[PDB]
Amino acid sequence: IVGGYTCGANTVPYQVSLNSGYHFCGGSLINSQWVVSAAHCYKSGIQVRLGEDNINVVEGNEQFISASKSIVHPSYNSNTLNNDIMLIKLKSAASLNSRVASISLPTSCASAGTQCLISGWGNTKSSGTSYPDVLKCLKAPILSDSSCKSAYPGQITSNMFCAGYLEGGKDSCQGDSGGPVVCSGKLQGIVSWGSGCAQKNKPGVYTKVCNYVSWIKQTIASN
Ligand SMILES: [Ca+2]
User: Fold this and answer.
1) Which residues of this UniProt protein bind Ca(2+)?
2) Residue 36's closest CA among 72, 66, 63?
3) What is the CA radius of gyration of the chain?
């Protein structure tokens, strides 16, 4: 997250870190057994880390649980990033508490102008690299689909939305991928892609979760 703020420990209780020896992507806890992330974060050998603040220090609220199964969306296209969503099932159920909590799925799509919370452990610089140990946060609005499409000609599908600031300076970045965009208590986006990070006229692009609720619910119901 570039241009954000330190969230505070366990203030984003649905935020998970996906670990394969190191943090590599975020995700969102949606029930005691399932995490939502980006399909482009897929890899084998994932350990889901819940209850994290400092990802390099055991602070006392963590739950580390191996993934038993990952399900990339049927229609994920890695070249365009269309349908950039996956589900990860945990080998054992998380113990839900005030610091480890699921986030609700949307019932309707969000609208341009709604202010959302974006979070992660990704790069905090837009020229240069610095990776934080503690969780970072950014409050940002959803942008209109017309401004999103004009920012990224030929690239924005109906399964994507833009959020952030056209003036630059505030955005998600490398290492935030797969993490949450939460608006009014609902998971509306997944950190997906962008041109660089925090660049003028280049807002963040996010997977449009509301399009996937049916798939998510049916997948959980049979897996
Ligand atoms: Ca920790």
Assistant:
1) 52, 54, 57, 62
2) 72
3) 16
Q: Who's near 74: CB < 8 A, 6+ residues apart?
A: 83, 215
Give the determination technique. Answer: X-ray
Ligand 1 centroid to residue 146 C-alpha, Å: 40
CA distance 183 to 117: 6
Known catalytic membership, residue 144 = no
* 1-12+103-210 and 13-102+211-222, same CATH topology: yes
**Cβ proximity of 24 and 37 under 8 Å:** no
Whether CATH 3.40.50.150 fits 1-12+103-210: no
Hey, how many other C-beta atoms are within 10 angstroms of the C-beta on 217? 11
For residue 61, report the distance from its CA to the centre of ligand 1, in Å. 8
Arch. (CATH architecture) of 13-102+211-222: Beta Barrel (2.40)
Resolution of the experimentally solved model in angstroms? 0.9
Half-sphere exposure of 143 (CA within 13 A, CB side): 24
Q: Using CA of residue 207, residue 204, residue 27, residue 18, what is the dihedral sign?
A: positive
